[model samples]
Target: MQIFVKTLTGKTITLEVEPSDTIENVKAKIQDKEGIPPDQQRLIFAGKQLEDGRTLSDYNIQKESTLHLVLRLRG
Candidate 1:
């Protein structure tokens, strides 16, 4: 399934990830795509942090659903 992720820098990235892809995998992808460090990445779905080691299917992410990614930036 494809997921749309929005960055804190006002950039939106669309990723095609498999249902088996874990949140950590998504975080790695986001780090590669948006240059946001995995350690600093936060995946918020419905105003909650998606727990690590959880797959997209675990979160019940539907097809073409958008996932909001908030970057924990530092000064």
Candidate 2:
């Protein structure tokens, strides 16, 4: 399955992942493409926060889904 994560800047990054992947894995993918740290990324889907230890399967995130990305300040 695939997911589209959108940033506040209006750019969206597309990722192909599996149901078994954890939320941390998804953040790592975003970090790979965008150079953002996984710890600094906030993922929101269906009005709920995606925890690092949770798997996509737990959230029933099959098919294509859109997630909103909010970044935390580093300083």
Candidate 3:
């Protein structure tokens, strides 16, 4: 299934990931695409924070779902 990912830098990346893909894996992919490290990444879904080790299946992610990733930046 294809998932639409939005990064903290205001970039949108669409990828075809399986239901078995974990949130940690997705975070790594986002890091590769946006150059942001996983430790600094925050994923929000359904108005709440998503844990790293959970899979798409665990989160009930459907095809074409849009997941927002935000980077916590310090001044």
Candidate 4:
């Protein structure tokens, strides 16, 4: 599936991925592109916090869906 990641500050990135990918995996990709640490990031989709162990499909992520990225402080 392909999805969009949008930050609160309005930064957005699109990525093509597999539904089997873990949230942790997604975070790692975001960390690479946005220079935010995986542990310092929170992924939210459909008004829910996405867990590291959970797969993208577990949250019913769809193509072109937008995921919110919250960069945590105090890292």
Candidate 5:
């Protein structure tokens, strides 16, 4: 399935992902596609933060889910 990742700076990235994929895995993909490292990205869905050790399914993230990506300034 595909999901939308929106950044604070108003950039939106459409990514194809699986429910079984971990948040870290998704972050790696974002790094590859957008050049933002995993540590610098804080992902949120349904007002809750997504943890790197958990899978998308763990947060009930489904197809077309829009995750807010907040970039860390220090990194």
Candidate 6:
């Protein structure tokens, strides 16, 4: 259940997450891996924004598929 993600900062990382895993879980992993907190991370899949409660499979994410990441701003 590994997938590739590309951050807006030009970072690309591969994560091992189950298809049934929650989006929040993935966010937390990204946070732990890259120091971007769950609340401060935004995800986009297939040109659509991903929701926290949704599962990876819910978004139809596939291996080698890339997720676009955007760090949430505090301004």
Question: Which candidate should be chosen as best, given TM-score against the real structure?
Answer: 5
Per-residue lDDT of model 1, residues 7-57, tens digit only? 667877898799899999999988788777888888977676897788998
**lDDT at position 53, candidate 3:** 84
lDDT of 6 at 48: 91
Residues 1-75, model 2: lDDT tens digits: 888888889998899999999999999999999999998899998899989999988888877788899999868
Candidate 4 accuracy as lDDT: 0.88
For each candidate in the order shown, give its overall lDDT on alpha carbons: 0.83, 0.90, 0.84, 0.88, 0.93, 0.88
Q: Name the regions of candidate 3 deviating beyond 4 angstroms.
A: none
Which of the predicted structures, 2 or 6, would earn the higher lDDT when compared with the native?
2
Please estimate how well model 2 matches the true structure, expressed as its whole-model Cα lDDT. Answer: 0.90
Candidate 2 segments whose C-alpha is farther than 4 A from its true place: none
- TM-score for each model: 0.85, 0.92, 0.85, 0.92, 0.94, 0.92
Clashing pairs in 2: none
lDDT-wise, the better of 1 and 2 is 2
Candidates 5 and 6 compared: the better one by TM-score is: 5
Displacement of the residue 65 alpha carbon in candidate 4, Å = 0.7
Question: Which is the better candidate, 3 or 6, if ranked by lDDT?
Answer: 6
- TM-score, structure 2 vs. true: 0.92
lDDT: which is higher, 2 or 4?
2
Error of 4 at 62 (Å): 1.7
The better candidate by lDDT, 1 or 6, is: 6
TM value for model 3: 0.85
